């Protein structure tokens, strides 16, 4: 069976009711990315940034938010391929996990985790983060921050991701904008190592022309259709 690397972005979770920033205006929930997703923004107005991620974290866990058929299809793909499948996501939601995928690399972190600003240790966290919330991993308790990678910070799991990029027979980018690096450059890396590259998206990404195979439309229709095609090809 081929080695398959999937990269997902915000597009796949749009139908589930989770929005993201837009290059059209450069706004995430009508906030400038500078203010809610940079280390400077956090330093300038920690109250606002914690409030922002508190709102995102609460909204993620509302009953109307559910994985969609695209998430479910990727779980079936992992079921079929086992160890020869890897899912890397730019998303900070937990919808891949709720769909049944395991060993997901969250390269930009996770909304349902916080991190000790001192030790870097990570905690599961489903509620609000308030100023009174400090770590329990340090002798001198330190403030908690969202375990979310901000612009200007290094993504998580990059060594493992680049290993997979050089190993993949098929690289599939799903729901990515082509505007966020290094993730948007992964297709170039995959191609260099001889991978067959596929884009599945609601609309073409900036780097769409670099993909060998491309399908566009609602993720909940396009992704199950491609996964079915791929699984049938495997006999």
């Amino acid at each position: 069976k081929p080695r398959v690397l999937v990269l997902t972005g915000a597009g796949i979770s749009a139908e589930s009711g989770i929005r993201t920033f837009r290059a059209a205006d450069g706004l995430w929930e009508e906030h400038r990315v500078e203010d809610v997703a940079t280390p400077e923004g956090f330093d300038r107005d920690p109250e606002l940034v914690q409030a922002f991620y508190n709102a995102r974290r609460r909204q993620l866990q509302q009953p109307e938010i559910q994985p969609n058929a695209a998430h479910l299809a990727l779980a079936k793909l992992q079921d079929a391929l086992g160890d020869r499948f890897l899912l890397v996501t730019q998303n900070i939601d937990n919808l891949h996990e709720r769909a049944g995928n395991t060993n997901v690399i969250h390269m930009h972190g996770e909304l349902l985790k916080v991190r000790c600003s001192q030790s870097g240790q990570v905690l599961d966290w489903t509620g609000d983060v308030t100023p009174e919330d400090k770590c329990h991993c340090c002798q001198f308790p330190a403030p908690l921050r969202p375990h979310v990678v901000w612009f200007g910070e290094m993504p998580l799991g990059m060594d493992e991701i680049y290993m997979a990029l050089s190993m993949a027979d098929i690289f599939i980018a799903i729901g990515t904008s082509g505007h966020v690096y290094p993730a948007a450059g992964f297709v170039h890396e995959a191609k260099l190592h001889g991978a067959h590259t596929v884009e599945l998206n609601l609309e073409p990404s900036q780097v769409g022309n670099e993909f060998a195979e491309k399908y566009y439309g609602p993720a909940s229709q396009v992704v199950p259709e491609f996964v079915e095609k791929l699984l049938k090809g495997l006999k």
């Binding site: 290059a23 990315v33 612009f151 290094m154 993504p155 505007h179 966020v180 690096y181 290094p182």
Partner: peptide
């Protein structure tokens, strides 16, 4: 691959 960055 460098830091998380737009554009």
């Amino acid at each position: 691959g460098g830091a998380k960055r737009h554009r």
